[PDB]
Amino acid sequence: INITSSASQEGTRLNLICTVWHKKEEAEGFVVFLCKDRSGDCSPETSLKQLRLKRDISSQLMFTISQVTPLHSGTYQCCARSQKSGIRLQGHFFSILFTNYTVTGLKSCKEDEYPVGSECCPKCSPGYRVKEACGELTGTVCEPCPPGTYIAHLNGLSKCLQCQMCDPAMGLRASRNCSRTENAVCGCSPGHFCIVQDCAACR
Ligand SMILES: *[C@@H]1O[C@H](CO)[C@@H](O[C@@H]2O[C@H](CO)[C@@H](O[C@@H]3O[C@H](CO)[C@@H](O)[C@H](O[C@@H]4O[C@H](CO)[C@@H](O)[C@H](O)[C@@H]4O)[C@@H]3O)[C@H](O)[C@H]2NC(C)=O)[C@H](O)[C@H]1NC(C)=O
Ligand SMILES: *[C@@H]1O[C@H](CO)[C@@H](O[C@@H]2O[C@H](CO)[C@@H](O)[C@H](O)[C@H]2NC(C)=O)[C@H](O)[C@H]1NC(C)=O
Structure with missing residues (x-):
C-alpha cells in the first residue's frame, strides 16, 4: 500500500494525478480524493474531486485543469482511505504557483508536515496515528486510533494519547x-x- 502524486501538462491542460497501490481485496470500500488548501482536514466531503470503488491493484484519480489561473494557485494534497481497513494515506503536498505558473513539491518543514530523517512527512489526520512514515516519493500511512485513545490535532505521532x-x-x-x-x-x-x-x- 502506498500513495503518490504527480502531474502532466498536455496542451494548455494541466492534469493532477493521485495514484494509489493497494491490496486487491482492500479495493472494495476504497476512496481517493484530492483537496486544495485544507487545514489538514482533507475529507472526501471537502475534496475538489473524489473517486470511490468497489470490486467483488492500483487506483488513480485525475483532476484536469484546462487552463491554469490564479484561482488554481494553492497547496494540494492527494489522500485516500480504506473503508473496510480504516487505513488512510496522506500524499505529499504540492502547490501550484501562478506568476505563468510552476508546480512544486512534486518529486524546514511546512505547518502540516512533521520532520523525519532527511524528509518532511505529511501529518496524519485527527484521530489517527502514523502507521508508516513517508518515503521520498510516497506519503504517510495512518491508522485510526484504537478504542481508549485519541489525538485531537493533525500529527506525526506514532502512538495515540490515552484518554x-x-x-x-x-x-x-x-x-x-x-x-x-x-x-x-x-x-x-x-x-x-x-x-x-x-x-x-x-x-
Ligand atoms: C508502490 O507500491 C507498488 C505496489 O506495491 C510498487 O509496485 C511493486 O514494486 C515492487 C518493488 O519495485 C515490485 O517488485 C519487483 O517484482 C519483480 C518480480 O516481478 C522482482 O524482480 C523484483 O525484485 C527486485 O530484485 C530482487 C530479486 O527479485 C529482489 O530481491 C529485490 O527486492 C528487488 O526489488 C521486485 O520483487 C512489484 O512488481 C510491484 N508490484 C506490482 C503489482 O506492480 C511501486 O513500486 C510503489 N511505488 C513507489 C513509488 O514506491
Ligand atoms: C458515553 O456512552 C454511554 C452509552 O451511550 C452514555 O450513557 C448515558 O448515560 C446517561 C447518564 O448516566 C444515562 O441516562 C443513559 O443510560 C445514557 N444515555 C444515552 C443518551 O445514551 C454516556 O453518557 C456517554 N457520554 C456522553 C457524554 O454521551
Missing part, C-alpha cells in the same frame, strides 16, 4: 466520552459538586 479515565470513587464520571479525536472529560456524578480542579474529585 483520561474518571474515577467513580471520587464522584467523577465522564461528562464527554472518549472518541478517536476527542479526549474524555471528567465531570461530577449525580447530585455531586466539584472541589478539586484540573475535576479531579467531587462531593
Whole structure:
C-alpha cells in the first residue's frame, strides 16, 4: 500500500494525478480524493474531486485543469482511505504557483508536515496515528486510533494519547466520552459538586 502524486501538462491542460497501490481485496470500500488548501482536514466531503470503488491493484484519480489561473494557485494534497481497513494515506503536498505558473513539491518543514530523517512527512489526520512514515516519493500511512485513545490535532505521532479515565470513587464520571479525536472529560456524578480542579474529585 502506498500513495503518490504527480502531474502532466498536455496542451494548455494541466492534469493532477493521485495514484494509489493497494491490496486487491482492500479495493472494495476504497476512496481517493484530492483537496486544495485544507487545514489538514482533507475529507472526501471537502475534496475538489473524489473517486470511490468497489470490486467483488492500483487506483488513480485525475483532476484536469484546462487552463491554469490564479484561482488554481494553492497547496494540494492527494489522500485516500480504506473503508473496510480504516487505513488512510496522506500524499505529499504540492502547490501550484501562478506568476505563468510552476508546480512544486512534486518529486524546514511546512505547518502540516512533521520532520523525519532527511524528509518532511505529511501529518496524519485527527484521530489517527502514523502507521508508516513517508518515503521520498510516497506519503504517510495512518491508522485510526484504537478504542481508549485519541489525538485531537493533525500529527506525526506514532502512538495515540490515552484518554483520561474518571474515577467513580471520587464522584467523577465522564461528562464527554472518549472518541478517536476527542479526549474524555471528567465531570461530577449525580447530585455531586466539584472541589478539586484540573475535576479531579467531587462531593
Ligand atoms: C508502490 O507500491 C507498488 C505496489 O506495491 C510498487 O509496485 C511493486 O514494486 C515492487 C518493488 O519495485 C515490485 O517488485 C519487483 O517484482 C519483480 C518480480 O516481478 C522482482 O524482480 C523484483 O525484485 C527486485 O530484485 C530482487 C530479486 O527479485 C529482489 O530481491 C529485490 O527486492 C528487488 O526489488 C521486485 O520483487 C512489484 O512488481 C510491484 N508490484 C506490482 C503489482 O506492480 C511501486 O513500486 C510503489 N511505488 C513507489 C513509488 O514506491
Ligand atoms: C458515553 O456512552 C454511554 C452509552 O451511550 C452514555 O450513557 C448515558 O448515560 C446517561 C447518564 O448516566 C444515562 O441516562 C443513559 O443510560 C445514557 N444515555 C444515552 C443518551 O445514551 C454516556 O453518557 C456517554 N457520554 C456522553 C457524554 O454521551
